Each structure stands twice: as C-alpha cells, then as structure tokens.
Amino acid sequence: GLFGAIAGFIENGWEGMIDG
C-alpha cells in the first residue's frame, strides 16, 4: 500500500526532505 510508495520516495526524491 501507500507505505510502499513512501518507500518509493525514500529512494526517489528523499533528498528534498533531507534538506531543511
């Protein structure tokens, strides 16, 4: 489910939430 798409983001754009 969604959690898997968050795991997607964690490997695919995560850096934008590493920032700040």
Q: Quick one: residue 13, left, alpha or beta (phi over 0 = left, psi -120 to 50 = alpha)? A: left
Residue 13 has which token pair? 């754009």
DSSP the chain: -HHHHHHHHHHTTTHHHH--
Question: Can you tell me the distance from the alpha carbon of 20 to that of 10, in angstroms, rounded to the nearest whole number?
Answer: 16
**Exposure of 7 in the CB half-sphere (CA atoms within 13 A):** 4
Question: Can you tell me the distance from the alpha carbon of 12 to that of 9, in angstroms, rounded to the nearest whole number?
Answer: 4
Q: How was this structure determined?
A: NMR
